[PDB]
Symmetry: none
Subunit: 128 residues, 4 copies
Amino acid sequence: AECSVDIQGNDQMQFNTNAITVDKSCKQFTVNLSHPGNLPKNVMGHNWVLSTAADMQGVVTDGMASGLDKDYLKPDDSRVIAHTKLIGSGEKDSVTFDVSKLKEGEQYMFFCTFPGHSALAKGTLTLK
Amino acid sequence: AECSVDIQGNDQMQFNTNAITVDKSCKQFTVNLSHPGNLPKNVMGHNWVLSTAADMQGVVTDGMASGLDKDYLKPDDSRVIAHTKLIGSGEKDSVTFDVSKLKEGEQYMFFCTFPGHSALAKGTLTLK
Amino acid sequence: AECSVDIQGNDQMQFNTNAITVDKSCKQFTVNLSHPGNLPKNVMGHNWVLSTAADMQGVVTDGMASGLDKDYLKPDDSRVIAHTKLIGSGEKDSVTFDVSKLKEGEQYMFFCTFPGHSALAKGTLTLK
Amino acid sequence: AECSVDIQGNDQMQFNTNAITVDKSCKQFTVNLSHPGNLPKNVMGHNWVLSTAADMQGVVTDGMASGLDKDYLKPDDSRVIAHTKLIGSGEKDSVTFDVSKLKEGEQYMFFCTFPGHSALAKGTLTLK
Ligand SMILES: [Cu+2]
Ligand SMILES: [Cu+2]
Ligand SMILES: [Cu+2]
Ligand SMILES: [Cu+2]
């Protein structure tokens, strides 16, 4: 509530929400991710990455090839509007970003870049 | 909250939740399912089916064998605790079941049986 | 292997391959598609659509709007480099294309345009 | 074809097949597994475990609890009919079993027990 959202990635690779509504009146928007489970980073690590539905696929392919020290994200990926760290069981991670990096008339996708998870852990973000 | 749940399945095959908690004092429990999108039942229909985590894959395999006229649920499946019918977008359906068919301790999966969707349209139900 | 590849889309909405590699010494490349399941193409149809990684989302969204009768592909779409027809279990379709249309350094993604199938029925294709 | 199939787990967490049919004329059936991508065993290793459609939840649960060191498989698990070792890209493994351990009319699921992979890396097996 306000200009933030608390989201969870479980051991079953599913976020607890498929949709995030960003109110255009927010100057900044924060996402507080938690990985409630028992599995660790290297096996079920989850990050929350934000891209345009159109770049997502390249973000994902590239992120896969970047490894864990990279959090499965390509360093200095212009396509990545925002992201948290790859966390694991019990760790938390927040991210704050400028809402002005977002424009209406665009479809944004949030997902996780850990190899193979994007197929299940993803959703939509809209500026309304 | 209390003794009902309203859930939505959308056009990307995801349920709006992946955890349902049934209070042990509800005599009955009602699951209200709706389908937001723009897609027809034969292409993107959902149903909500409840079964033990054990029976889920057999109910899911026997379901697509049953075809669209059977809501992709074998009829009289003994492993199905409760189910709605397959709804296309624009539709809705409620199912009201007896809380005495569930034992605490035991694990339950809710899911969709439409061909290949249970891979993403699934979650857990807990008597609490 | 050679200058052609056999691909299968099944009843679970998955392709047997998620990575293809075209040898530069191939003038053309042939994709032979089949559908090893039991379901109809109005329920579980599959096509093989080739676009760049960047254009995938557009072709898919534009494609799901043109419905069945148009094989879920927007006609005369300029992002589609090559495609098959939508087939059902039991059907077949191959498409030969010009390798000269691919360029080294670009990221191509193959997918199926049927509603929701690209969630798993997708893969990368690269020149080599 | 004949009394064996070649299966393959990739970097997307999928098998090239989700349906196996063991003919009643096979005295032994063989599964040759492979891992066509390039991620390692600790990130994306996969195995091939056969059990009844009924026993799959548990094998999988006791298995992800056992650890990589144990091929994520409960040592001396009874519900497991056959299985290979966990392989990473580049590696191969095979398992041959007697068709006598299987019966007609019963439903089996082949799968991978590496944490979370059975969500997609799963299939059916029937003696025909
Ligand atoms: Cu994840
Ligand atoms: Cu569904
Ligand atoms: Cu398809
Ligand atoms: Cu695996």
